Amino acid sequence: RRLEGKVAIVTGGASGIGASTVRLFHDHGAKVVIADIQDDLGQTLADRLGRNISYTHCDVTDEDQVRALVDAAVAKHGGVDIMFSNAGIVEGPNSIFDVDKDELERLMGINLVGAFLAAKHAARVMVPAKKGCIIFTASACTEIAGIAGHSYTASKYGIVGLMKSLAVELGSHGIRANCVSPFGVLMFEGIMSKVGNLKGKILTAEDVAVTVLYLASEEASYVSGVNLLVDGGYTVVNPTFINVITA
Amino acid sequence: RRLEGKVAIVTGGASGIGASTVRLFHDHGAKVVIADIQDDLGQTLADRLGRNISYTHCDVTDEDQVRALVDAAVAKHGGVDIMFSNAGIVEGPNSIFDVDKDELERLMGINLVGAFLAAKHAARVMVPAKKGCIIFTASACTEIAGIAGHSYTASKYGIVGLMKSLAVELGSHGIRANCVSPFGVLTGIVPDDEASKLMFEGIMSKVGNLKGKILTAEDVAVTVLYLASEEASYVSGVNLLVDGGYTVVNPTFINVITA
Amino acid sequence: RRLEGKVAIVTGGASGIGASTVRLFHDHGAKVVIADIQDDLGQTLADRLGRNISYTHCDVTDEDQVRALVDAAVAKHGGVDIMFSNAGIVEGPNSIFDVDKDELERLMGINLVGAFLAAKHAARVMVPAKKGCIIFTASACTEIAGIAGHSYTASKYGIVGLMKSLAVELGSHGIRANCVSPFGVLTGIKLMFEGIMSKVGNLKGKILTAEDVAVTVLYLASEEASYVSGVNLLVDGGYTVVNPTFINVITA
Amino acid sequence: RRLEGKVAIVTGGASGIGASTVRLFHDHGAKVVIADIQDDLGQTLADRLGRNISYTHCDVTDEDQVRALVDAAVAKHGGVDIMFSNAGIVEGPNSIFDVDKDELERLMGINLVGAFLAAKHAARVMVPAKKGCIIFTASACTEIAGIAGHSYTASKYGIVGLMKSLAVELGSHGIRANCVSPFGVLMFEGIMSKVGNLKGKILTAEDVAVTVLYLASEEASYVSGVNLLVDGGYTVVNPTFINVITA
Ligand SMILES: NC(=O)c1ccc[n+]([C@@H]2O[C@H](COP(=O)([O-])OP(=O)(O)OC[C@H]3O[C@@H](n4cnc5c(N)ncnc54)[C@H](O)[C@@H]3O)[C@@H](O)[C@H]2O)c1
């Protein structure tokens, strides 16, 4: 009901948060182009959900695959309303001595260059429509340390800067750019229930997906430039002091 | 719908943003008690809105009125799910030479002390329930200067500090706390002249970064609905700006070089 | 001697951070008016330091006392170059059920209302001179929760907002306004406290004292920061940038 | 003389802000290794200044040169106290349609990958010394839009993220990590005087160097994790609104 008639591309959408966002976008009447490099998962999901969900293989590090992905969406569906640049790779907390220059440049290619390209070509076709919404997947590590590795946090910080620069530029054309910075997805929930600030609730892929839905829906028509954290308050506190003197 | 069976108290709900949230919360099936000091506006709206909408006069600077507001709401409905601490007064851009120690202490009492009290007694009844959501109305001036007066911006900065410390404290009980920072909504700030309205909105469209839509009270209401909905079940500690990116840009540099 | 010929007023300057900044400003050649309400401590410091240090009793809650403080500094010294609004009262981490409306309004008067007044009358004499620097004492609690109480946290946040609008307004007259946000709970803290320092401080091997915070104010007030305005400069050893819970549960 | 006996490496130190910091570091009694790829400027500068200023050519995108830059510096002077990771390239305000994947990757290598490497090998040799300070040159564009290009802005956000996670990790070894984010230093002064928020004063390289001196001095012994802006308040205001309502 909320996304009726809208066309959304979700890179990295064959699995996890992107797949949860694809299904929820499908439930709200959006035509969704699943983009990923896991072709069996992507094709299986796009067929199971039905006629308005297609799949397109797209390694986001190849600008030509990306340009073609958006161009196939405009030809097939008339245009692109939503670009959910979610394709990335994740590393947990590490040390600066664990950073390998080739691993670093690879992560930067998927995480930062991939977001750059997915934005450029979403912007390429959105600008003439004088409509459009771009949502990147950052990470809660954009507002606190100790929950991701050095290469990962820096790539996600760069997405936030890209998101704000796109919000100002594409704002003149009625186009919004936003981030969602989730906290903990990929025994594991027991560890999450111990570290979360907001106790009781566990963070799931749909939880992040319904937040992307908000940012992409007309309900957030005036939300732009925003890196919306979904962390249950994890990033606003350093409990070390309180633990040493109250526990 | 999204708020069905939930009980929300909305301070400042007799006009503007608070009233738009009352109507929207009402449309989504919540029991809503309008809390305000404009008694004609507040009472008439709650009666016209219907059965699930009550009114309670409450000057938020008076802790006894605030304690009573929540206590009678708990008696009427069993508990409080949502507290939208929205009551406030606004100052436009001014000079530090215009601040009068009384006008400042008055501004602080309504905006910041009211925010503390509305949260204190909302937590009083929410903590035992192990459930609840508290939402404060801050201001876009909490992330940029040049769009509000000194006392007003300082009160809203203090609301943000309060929101984040409540997010940590009440988080142990499954209770969420968040802010909304709107950017110039046509409201009880602006008088009722259609002229005074079209001019406020027209300049807001000029100064706005995101062109092609105007920001209204209902737009802010739908974000409060999001923040209070279970759809934001893991969103806490956040000051969500609704400004179309106004606070992320200083266009002076680019303007000077397009000569 | 970085403050040669400069005249600085330091509210709350009879003790702690304010006293360390008065001494350091004195060492750098500034004429300093100590402003406080601890008259025993306040007068003793201004006399012991020497000829360029006077004292002026001033409750920052009283606009007439503060208006006199600035007017006396102008009378004795020609003008005001630096206003260090340091006067405040402190709360550690607490619960919102511990907040008393009268105690809240008292803290707000000293911490926030006082900062406004010291700025209004510092601006009063700085603007016609088309120069001046106003520095507030905020707190590291302005960037993280859990290291100050609700009332204290909100008052220092309000100082940060006040500082930024003054930075915009007073910038047009060549006047800079900045905050310093120390890690107050850890400043100048026995083997109990030494154990707590190692556990809670992020930058290990070092300790924060009042003298350390004074030199950051010296930096912020000197000409070394001629283009530094609008800044909330933390002196916290990086405490506010990390939530170590996650790695802690998974390293055990 | 605040830096007596301290050893500083300054990448990008043959010109601009890096050269200004080299001279000031020289005046405060530091041994400085000028690191740059402008060999004529860099070698001439290191010779003019004297005994305590040497030169080392170093492309920061080449980890082997960077690993060598630190190792030759430790060999010559005993250790590295200050690492001023200043080497970078600049992009002005532009459009997302102007970003070319190869220019994007080139800028990213110099600005961000250089920052990772320069910190990694400074961290390599600082950690055993249980002392040390790393200072990155970020940018005012990390706190406001409209004053730099998309690729540059994202690279500088990434430096800030790197700095924050390094501040947490290397803090355990008594090592500090901070940024400096200057505004307009790289006809011209009239534009700066009318775009600046703090009127009456103009920002120069000498100004940024003394802020770097502060951050590198022991006067800042408990400052870590900070991105210190030197912008005269430019990033804290959007004056568009007040302009329209004043005349
Ligand atoms: N309208 C804008 O442009 C804008 C922009 C940013 C932030 N805000 C914030 O939105 C908040 C809500 O105000 P609004 O914009 O909806 O205008 P409004 O005047 O229409 O509504 C504010 C309500 O608070 C009530 N109020 C004043 N003092 C009170 C007290 N002691 N106790 C209880 N209620 C009291 C008023 O009666 C009013 O019904 C304000 O706190 C304001 O700071 C507004």
Ligand SMILES: [Cl-]
């Ligand atoms: Cl009324």
Ligand SMILES: [Cl-]
């Ligand atoms: Cl900002």
